[PDB]
Amino acid sequence: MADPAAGEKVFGKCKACHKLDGNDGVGPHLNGVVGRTVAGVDGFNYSDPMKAHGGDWTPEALQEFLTNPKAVVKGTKMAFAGLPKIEDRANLIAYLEGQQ
């Protein structure tokens, strides 16, 4: 279950906040976020528990952060409730590996 064309319609839930193409806006640019540090865009103003995490966004840490953002980063400035199916986050993770 890694379909990148289905991850474009799931990324329509993200793309009012997050762009990919340099702009930022409400959330940062996600252009290769799979394998980037937590708090990893030099320019965007991040929250305290996002900066105190560090490390990396793996295709596994993103799979439970994209369904409960406040369970993995407790007190994030990301105003997002969660994705429901494991196919929704796995298809989006397959999209923004290639589409960046």
How is residue 43 written in tokens? 């320019």
Q: Interface with ligand HEC includes 26 (CB under 6 A)? A: yes
First to last CA, the chain: 20
CB 28 within 8 A of CB 41: yes
Q: Interface with ligand HEC includes 95 (CB under 6 A)? A: no
Instruction: List the one residue from 4, 70, 78, 99 that touches ligand HEC (CB under 6 A).
Output: 78
Question: By rule CB under 6 A, what string of x and - marks binding of each residue 27-66 to ligand HEC?
Answer: xx-x--x----xxxx----xx--x------x--------x
CB 29 within 8 A of CB 56: no
